[PDB]
Write a protein that binds this ligand. Structure first.
Ligand SMILES: Nc1ncnc2c1ncn2[C@@H]1O[C@H](COP(=O)(O)OP(=O)(O)OP(=O)(O)O)[C@@H](O)[C@H]1O
Ligand SMILES: Nc1ncnc2c1ncn2[C@@H]1O[C@H](COP(=O)(O)OP(=O)(O)OP(=O)(O)O)[C@@H](O)[C@H]1O
Ligand SMILES: [Mg+2]
Ligand SMILES: [Mg+2]
Lengths: 131, 53, 906, 385, 303
């Protein structure tokens, strides 16, 4: 719908060209003498904007690392593809530290809380909401 | 050969446009045989066909 | 080619083909060492010039490139163009071709670009000397033949063209731009342009249209006048000079908008005036449409000669030709003042003499009737109008009319139009008034009203010289307070006088056309008449018409028909102007309503005419908008909307028609298509829109003067039998009329098939019947054109009533209007002092061959036809005079003009 | 230069403008297909199907039925159906029948045939008058008959006699009657149909006459018209074999043409040009002398005439500066313009053979020798001596 | 699509509804089937002996319009609308048309005999006419439509005969070729024995362009026709080549050829390969026998 009307405007200006070379000489002064549209730069015209709805992903450039080696913060409760799980390490800066070692795999993992007496938000299960 | 050759290039654009129109047009093919009062005919016509004579 | 040293002078030329020794080593070293040796260089300049001339014949790129390679360097590298000031300046003559050898003979993209700029600078500096002119000249008139110079010389000419065009596009101008590096004006390049123009006018045609067009000033054109008027007869004949002037105007008409377009054509008129033929002068003066220019040529023959001579007769003929009658009014009364003879002179200017010549033509053409014999109901009404349509122009069919039987059987609005049709039998004739008079003093008011319409039509051929003017009769009726009587009266007055804005005619129509508070449907005729009067001449854009339109919108909106007619009347009024019409678009748009927007698109067409290409695209975006807005969403109102839609369709066609006739010359084959694609679109898209575009299409063709007339009306017609509104056929036939019995041959069968075949409503039948009779006039009695015929770029004033009627659904009331269809063309005859009514011979040719003119001056070969033939329409229009064969010299050149021939026999 | 520039101006704006307007419109049409349109096009497909067999409409029976004749040997009694009615049809028109169950489902041909294509031409003739130059007196029999009533039928009405009707070009080969037919029709200003009568001969049955019938229907639409049936001599009376025949259809075709001469209404507005070698190459059964009017008799160019013809040819011929026209005329005796045409071409061939650009007078004699060669007559001095 | 589809494009179809499959740029014509067995000629200028004048004329006729249609027009006028070969039998006119066409580099189709012969896909009473079309397709192409003629004088009168009509129709067509794709590039070489037995439409001089009589061969020509067969055979001992040529001169290149074969009957029997003067003397005596006997009856016992 967007392209139909963007192509409309542009094609009309192109056709008018041959007549336009000599017209354009008279057109310049008649704007200074009479009046202008709302701008005083050139005569600049419309261009129309086209419809692009999708913002596509490119592809990697590094297949040797698809997981770099740089740090990135990954939030708890997120999509975790098994490649990431190997490099997940629980940080000590938080209260929360694993009871044992971490498996290097995804799953339900229970942690030891050093301060459970300090307010942290907690994420309600479905069952909790209903109560 | 300036007096015709300069401006000849401009005409070649015009010939090209004459090429572009015929194909642009030929892309769109639709009917109808008859007119609006004979669009009624077909609703009847369906029936008279299913009958054998 | 190969070097063979200094053995003889022949082999010196061969030596310098590979390596010059008198232009490269010696000279180079000489310049870079001693400065006593500047004296040796000066003598050696002449020698160097000769070596270029001898080797001009050689065309090969390699042996000019390499040879002059180190000279090209020396400009900035060693000489630096100021090691001896005067001396390198005057030695720039051999070095200037060296630069051009890398521009044009060798193509290296990097150097070809760069040295274009260098060439412009050095051209300017060396044109101070005036020797850069002489440099151009030796290649323009040539000395040697080679492919090479013919490609080289141009580059020099193009430098000038480059800068001058650029000063308009980019406001900064001068040498501030590095695209030329040369100043736009100043007394160093201006004198160069004048001298250049002289040489290139004689031998070429090149830079002369480019320069005029390039200054953007009428001043450029007025310089052109001086040089050409010297050339007018001794250098070459009058005729050759004319083709140069009028082609500037027909050719540089384009890409001129209004204020310029008038100003360029002023100068062309003046060139013609200066030259021998005043015949060329009158044609251009009519074109401008200014009162002032008409008077000067008429005065030029009339005033200086005391004696009657040829001069008084010639003046009268020239003004007579326009059947607008704009020239007629102005030229009259000078004849009275001078007083050699009143009687011959006054009559000859008037369209009274045109009545008399028609009788001679009619004698050949005879009378053949074919009118419908049908009677009773609406078929009675159909037949009685049809009789008038077949007997258009002066015809004698008195006895049929005098049988009052069929006349009295018309009823209602039919009575009014029946009396009006009787008037068209005696169209362009003094006698006929008698038949009208009978009805006018008896029975119901309906026949009284119809009599007044008929007076209008009859009075077309006699309204000048104060010999029974339409004004005289019709004034009494305006006074009478009845609406039907008064409305009919002022309609007929407008038709008869046409483009004439005489004091009595105009000033009667001046207090009136200012009541629209009272709701009267038939008060359309109030503005409609005044609009018709205005066309044919420059327009004041009268304050009477503008005021009443606004007032009508305030008062009513109930009568949809009334406001639709009113809108058209404004747009037709403004015709005959375009400069002033830019102003009034804004004035109308000041007060804004959706109803007012309908008026605006019509008036845009007239304002922008003669440059419409911004107009064209606009009238297509307009079409789009209803559908378009709905499109986005998918993924009181009644009167305003309908007026909106209809106006646009009409406007699109009107814009188109005027443009294709005037600017650009060729495109007339395609526009007929610019419309078809519009129609195709509309038929699917909007159901309502399709109805309007059908009717408009026929008048598109008639106004536009299409070359093709066989294929397109007939083919469109078949699709349109089917589609509602049989008024489509009436509009097609006005084009198809052509030269009768050529185009109209196909037409009678084609229109007759649908009409005779299908009867399913006597209403539908009526439109079809009228159209068929219109198309043919028996035996090419007359032709109708929208165009003046005097100019084929022209446009009439009598045919504007035809153009008006195709904007509305068919109505019985509209039938009364359609009786009027005036627009006659006279058949040329060779005149004498005793007013000879026979032409001797003419050449006619279907297609002009000339490709120096677009209009095409008639060929001198032609194909010969006899005496006393009608001036043929399309496929016959170029007409040359055979009269030369009789020791007769035309006084009045005729190219297929309307104008009657006049000859002087030795 | 400027004459170019002006044309350039007009022709670019009209073409270019149009392309953009067509280009947008194809989209503007297709987006809305809601309401009336979708319904209409849909019904038309359903009633139809695929494939569709060509048919021909012989007649309509007044009960919404018709008699049709297929390209297959059978013929069939069908119903009239769809958007195309019997009011919208006319007999003799080609019509679309649905294959499986024969019923008229439509039309798209609308009486378009490979014979119809050849006959059609509504454009002016190629030759204009005295291309065709000269046989002036012969033109001054064809023009009388053919040009004059079309131009003004009035003349005959004042004269008080029936108008002319047709002409029979007959007599000598090689006078250009096949060219001449063209020359006149240009001058008049009328539509010019041209069909070769050899294509009205068919080995299929009832097809012969259908092809003759199409001609007069077309002629009447585009009236005034001059119809050239080229070679009516080629319908002739001939026979392929007499032991498997072929000589039946010839008669039925000849007959269908004799009837529409007069029988397509008494008009000189439906003119015919019949070119024939002689009258005794035709079927001897004939219409009466005034129905065909004047018979135009071509005979051999005389001495003056063949100067004219010769002169036309040799202007076209390049590099003949050593030829003088008169001397060619002296040696030759009376002959067609046909053989002048050949002599000029044989003279280029000789001079091309020799490899010499020039064309001599001497050259031409050699060409006379070749053409005249086998016309020799020694019984001329058999009588004289 | 309708876009891909042009007029005169041959297309493949189904039996169940006739829906398209593929475009074909191949063409199956009764003309194509005749070409296909024969294929190209092996003839060259020297396969045909003698006929010295005839070779030189016909190079200009056949080659030059094809290669340069403009040159042919510039120096002289027009283009040929045909070539007609006639002369006595055995002259080798059929062999000539094969000879020249080799060098021309075009598809020498020939077409043997009458063309009413097709009937097994349908009649031959319009493949004459449509020949115009078929030939155009297979450009650049040379049509050797042969018909030796035995129609006589009977149907020259009028323009009778149904064979003559169809031939006439093709000829009416035939003009259009100078205009239907510009100039000529396809030669219509007709071959008939004489002008008396000829068809009416082909009759008058230059009516189908180019009337070329083929002479009976001279003694010098007979000797050259003999020259080439000698290599093919075993070369004579004693060079007695001139003997044959002096003794008789024929009316055909066939009579010359007749000597070669006749000569090898006698050599074969003697059981000597090489041809000799004696083998020659027997061979010319045998071929001349046929002719002496009909020549003694007007040479003796006459008036
Ligand atoms: N009037 C003419 N002026 C110029 N050339 C002519 C003229 N008349 C005939 N010729 C030449 O002679 C040729 C032969 O004429 P054309 O083909 O019309 O013959 P025809 O009389 O119809 O014979 P047929 O009996 O075979 O139908 C023309 O093509 C033309 O070149
Ligand atoms: N010039 C030649 N050189 C060699 N052989 C020859 C020559 N001319 C003819 N012949 C022989 O004579 C035979 C018959 O000649 P061919 O059948 O080609 O004759 P034609 O003149 O075209 O006759 P027709 O009148 O039957 O069409 C050839 O097949 C060949 O064997
Ligand atoms: Mg003929
Ligand atoms: Mg043979």
């Amino acid at each position: 719908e967007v392209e139909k009307v963007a192509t409309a405007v542009l094609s009309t200006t192109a056709r008018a060209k041959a007549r336009a070379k000599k017209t354009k000489k008279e057109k310049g002064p008649n704007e200074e003498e009479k009046k202008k549209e709302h701008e005083e730069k050139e005569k600049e015209r419309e261009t129309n904007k086209k419809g692009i709805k999708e913002t596509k992903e490119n592809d990697e450039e590094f297949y040797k690392n698809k997981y770099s080696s740089k740090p990135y913060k990954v939030d708890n409760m997120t999509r975790i593809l098994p490649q990431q799980s190997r490099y997940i390490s629980f940080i000590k800066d938080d209260r929360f530290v694993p009871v044992r070692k971490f498996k290097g795999n995804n799953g339900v993992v229970v942690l030891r809380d050093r301060e459970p007496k300090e307010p942290v938000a907690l994420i309600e299960t479905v069952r909790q909401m209903k109560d | 050969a300036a007096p015709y050759a300069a401006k000849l290039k401009q005409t070649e654009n015009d010939l090209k446009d004459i090429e572009a129109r015929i194909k642009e047009k030929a892309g769109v093919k639709e009917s109808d045989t008859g007119l609006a009062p004979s669009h009624l005919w077909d609703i009847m016509g369906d029936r008279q066909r299913l009958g054998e004579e | 080619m190969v070097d063979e040293s200094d053995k003889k002078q022949q082999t010196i030329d061969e030596q310098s083909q590979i390596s010059p020794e008198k232009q490269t080593p010696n000279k180079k070293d000489k310049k870079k060492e001693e400065e006593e040796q500047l004296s040796e260089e000066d003598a050696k300049l002449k020698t160097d010039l000769e070596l270029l001339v001898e080797r001009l014949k050689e065309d090969d790129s390699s042996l000019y490139e390499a040879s002059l390679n180190a000279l090209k360097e020396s400009i900035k590298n060693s000489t630096s163009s100021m090691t001896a000031v005067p001396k390198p300046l005057k030695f720039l003559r051999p070095t200037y071709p060296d630069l051009c050898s890398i521009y044009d003979k060798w193509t290296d993209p990097n150097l070809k670009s760069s040295l274009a700029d260098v060439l412009s600078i050095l051209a300017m500096t060396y044109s101070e000397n005036g020797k850069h002119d002489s440099l151009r000249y030796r290649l323009l008139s040539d000395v040697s033949d080679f492919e090479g110079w013919g490609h080289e010389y141009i580059r020099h000419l193009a430098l000038e063209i480059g800068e001058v065009y650029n000063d308009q596009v980019e406001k900064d101008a001068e040498d501030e731009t590095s695209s030329d590096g040369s100043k736009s004006d100043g007394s160093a390049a201006t004198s160069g342009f004048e001298f250049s123009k002289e040489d290139t006018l004689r031998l070429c045609l090149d830079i002369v249209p480019y320069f005029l067009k390039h200054n953007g000033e009428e001043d450029a054109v007025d310089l052109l006048l001086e040089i050409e008027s010297i050339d007018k007869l001794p250098q070459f004949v009058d005729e050759n000079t004319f083709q140069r002037v009028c082609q500037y105007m027909v050719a540089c008409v384009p890409l001129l908008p209004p204020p310029e377009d008038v100003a360029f054509l002023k100068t062309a008129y003046s060139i013609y005036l200066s030259q021998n033929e005043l015949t060329d002068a009158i044609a251009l003066a009519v074109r401008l449409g200014e009162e002032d220019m008409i008077r000067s040529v008429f005065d030029a023959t009339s005033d200086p000669v005391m004696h009657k001579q040829l001069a008084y007769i010639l003046a009268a003929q020239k003004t007579s030709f326009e059947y607008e009658g704009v020239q007629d009014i102005i030229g009259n009364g000078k004849l009275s003042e001078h007083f050699l003879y009143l009687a011959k002179e006054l009559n000859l200017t008037g369209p009274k003499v045109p009545e008399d010549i028609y009788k001679s033509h009619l004698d050949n053409s005879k009378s053949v009737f074919s009118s419908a014999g049908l009677d009773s109901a609406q078929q009675n009404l159909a037949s009685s109008f049809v009789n008038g349509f077949l007997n258009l122009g002066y015809c004698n069919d008195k006895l049929i009319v005098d049988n009052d039987n069929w006349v009295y059987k018309t009823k209602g609005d039919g009575m009014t139009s029946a009396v009006a049709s009787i008037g068209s039998i005696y169209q362009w004739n003094l006698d006929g008034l008698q038949q009208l008079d009978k009805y006018l003093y008896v029975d119901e008011p309906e026949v009284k009203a119809g009599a007044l319409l008929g007076i209008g039509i009859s009075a077309s051929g006699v309204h000048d010289g104060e010999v029974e003017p339409a004004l005289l009769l019709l004034q009494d009726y305006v006074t009478n307070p009845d609406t039907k009587i008064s409305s009919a009266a002022i309609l007929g007055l407008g038709i008869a006088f046409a483009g004439s804005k005489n004091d009595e005619v105009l000033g009667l129509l001046l207090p009136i056309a200012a009541s629209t508070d009272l709701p009267i449907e038939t008060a359309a005729m109030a503005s409609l008449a005044l609009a018709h009067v205005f066309v044919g001449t420059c327009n004041g854009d009268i304050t009477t018409s503008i005021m009443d339109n606004f007032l009508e919108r305030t008062a009513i909106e109930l009568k949809t028909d009334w406001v639709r007619f009113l809108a058209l009347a404004l747009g037709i009024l403004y015709m005959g102007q375009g400069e002033q019409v830019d102003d009034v678009l804004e004035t109308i748009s000041a007060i804004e309503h959706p109803m007012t927007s309908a008026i605006e698109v019509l008036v845009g067409s007239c304002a922008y005419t003669g440059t419409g290409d911004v107009l064209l695209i606009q009238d297509l975006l307009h079409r789009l908008t209803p559908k378009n807005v709905k499109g986005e969403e998918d993924a009181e109102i009644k009167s305003e909307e309908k007026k909106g839609k209809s106006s646009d369709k009409d406007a699109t066609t009107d814009g188109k028609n005027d443009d294709e006739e005037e600017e650009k010359e060729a495109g007339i084959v395609d526009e007929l298509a610019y419309a078809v694609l519009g129609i195709a679109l509309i038929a699917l898209g909007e159901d309502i829109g399709k109805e309007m575009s059908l009717r408009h299409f026929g008048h598109l063709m008639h106004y536009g003067n299409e070359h093709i007339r066989r294929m397109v009306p007939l083919a469109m017609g078949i699709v349109s039998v089917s589609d509602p509104q049989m008024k489509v056929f009436d509009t097609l036939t006005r084009f198809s009329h052509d030269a009768d019995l050529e185009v109209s041959m196909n037409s009678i069968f084609a229109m007759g098939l649908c009409g005779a075949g299908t009867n399913n409503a006597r209403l539908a039948q009526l439109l079809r019947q009228l159209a068929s009779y219109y198309s043919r006039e028996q035996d090419a009695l007359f032709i109708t054109r929208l165009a003046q015929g005097l100019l084929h770029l022209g446009k009439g004033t009598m045919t504007m009533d035809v153009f008006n009627d195709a904007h509305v659904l068919n109505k019985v009331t509209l039938a009364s209007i359609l009786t009027t269809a005036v627009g006659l063309v006279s058949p040329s005859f060779m005149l004498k002092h005793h007013q000879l009514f026979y032409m001797l011979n003419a050449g006619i040719r279907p297609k002009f061959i000339l490709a120096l003119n677009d209009e095409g001056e008639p060929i001198k070969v032609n194909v010969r036809v006899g005496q006393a033939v009608e001036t043929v329409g399309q496929a016959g229009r170029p007409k040359k005079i055979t009269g030369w064969i009789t020791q007769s010299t035309p006084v009045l050149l005729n190219h297929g003009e309307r104008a009657e021939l006049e000859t002087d026999e030795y | 230069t400027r004459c170019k520039l002006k044309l350039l101006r007009m022709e670019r704006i009209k073409d270019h403008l149009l392309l953009e307007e067509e280009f947008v419109s194809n989209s503007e049409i297709l987006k809305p297909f809601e309401k009336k349109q979708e319904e209409e096009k849909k019904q038309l497909e359903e009633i139809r199907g695929n494939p569709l067999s060509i048919g021909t409409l012989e007649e309509i029976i007044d009960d919404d039925h018709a008699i049709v004749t297929s390209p297959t040997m059978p013929d069939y009694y069908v119903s009239i159906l769809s958007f195309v009615d019997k009011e919208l049809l006319e007999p003799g028109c080609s019509v679309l029948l649905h294959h499986k169950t024969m019923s008229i489902v439509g039309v798209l041909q609308d009486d378009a045939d490979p014979m119809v294509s050849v006959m059609k031409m509504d454009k002016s003739p190629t030759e204009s008058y005295s291309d065709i130059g000269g046989l002036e007196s012969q033109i001054q029999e064809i023009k009388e008959s053919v040009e004059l009533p079309l131009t003004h039928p009035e003349l005959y009405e004042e004269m008080g006699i029936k108008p002319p009707k047709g002409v029979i070009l007959y007599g000598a080969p090689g006078t250009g009657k096949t060219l001449l037919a063209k020359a006149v029709a240009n001058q008049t200003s009328a539509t010019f149909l041209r069909i070769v009568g050899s294509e009205l001969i068919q080995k299929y049955l009832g097809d012969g006459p259908r092809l003759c019938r199409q001609i007069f229907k077309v002629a009447g639409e585009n009236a005034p018209s001059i119809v050239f049936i080229d070679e009516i001599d080629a319908i002739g009376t001939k026979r392929y074999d007499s032991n498997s025949g072929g000589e039946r259809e010839i008669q039925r075709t000849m007959l269908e043409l004799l009837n529409q001469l007069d029988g397509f209404d008494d008009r000189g507005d439906v003119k015919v040009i019949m070119a024939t070698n002689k009258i005794e190459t035709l079927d001897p059964a004939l219409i009466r002398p005034g129905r065909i009017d004047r018979k135009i008799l071509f005979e051999n160019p005389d001495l003056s005439t063949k100067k004219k013809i010769l002169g036309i040819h040799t202007s076209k011929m390049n590099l003949s500066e050593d030829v003088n026209l008169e001397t060619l005329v002296t040696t030759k005796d009376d002959l067609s313009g046909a053989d002048i045409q050949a002599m000029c071409t044989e003279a280029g061939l000789l001079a091309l053979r020799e490899r010499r650009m020039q064309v001599t007078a001497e050259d031409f004699k050699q060409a006379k020798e070749r053409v005249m060669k086998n016309k020799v007559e020694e019984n001329l001095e058999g009588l004289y001596l | 699509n309708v876009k891909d589809l042009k007029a005169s494009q041959r297309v493949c179809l189904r039996s169940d509804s006739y829906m398209l499959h593929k475009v074909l740029e191949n063409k199956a014509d009764p003309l194509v089937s005749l070409m296909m067995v024969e294929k190209v000629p092996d003839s060259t200028y020297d396969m045909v002996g003698g006929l010295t004048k005839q070779i030189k004329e016909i190079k200009e006729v056949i080659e030059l319009p094809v290669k340069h249609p403009e040159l042919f027009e510039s120096l002289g006028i027009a283009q040929p609308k045909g070539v007609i070969l006639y002369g006595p039998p055995g002259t080798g006119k059929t062999l000539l048309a094969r000879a020249v066409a080799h060098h021309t580099d075009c598809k020498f189709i020939r077409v043997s005999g009458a063309e009413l012969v097709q009937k097994y896909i349908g009649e031959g009473s319009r493949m004459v006419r449509e020949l115009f079309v078929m030939a155009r397709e297979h450009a650049p192409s040379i049509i050797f439509m042969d018909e030796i003629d035995s129609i006589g004088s009977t149907r020259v009168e009028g323009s009778g005969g149904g064979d003559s009509e169809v031939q006439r129709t093709m000829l009416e067509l035939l003009n259009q070729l100078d205009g239907f794709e510009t100039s000529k590039n396809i030669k219509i070489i007709m071959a008939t024995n004489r002008l008396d037995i000829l068809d009416p439409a082909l009759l008058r001089p230059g009516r189908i362009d180019r009337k070329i009589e083929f002479p009976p061969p001279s003694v010098a020509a007979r000797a050259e026709i003999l020259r080439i067969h000698s290599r093919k055979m075993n070369l004579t001992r004693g060079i007695n080549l001139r003997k044959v040529a002096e003794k008789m001169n024929g009316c055909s290149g066939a009579d010359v050829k007749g000597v070669c074969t006749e000569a090898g009957m006698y050599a074969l029997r003697e059981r000597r390969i090489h041809v000799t003067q004696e083998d020659f003397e027997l061979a010319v005596g045998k071929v001349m026998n046929k002719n002496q006997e009909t020549a003694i009856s007007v040479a003796k016992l006459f008036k």
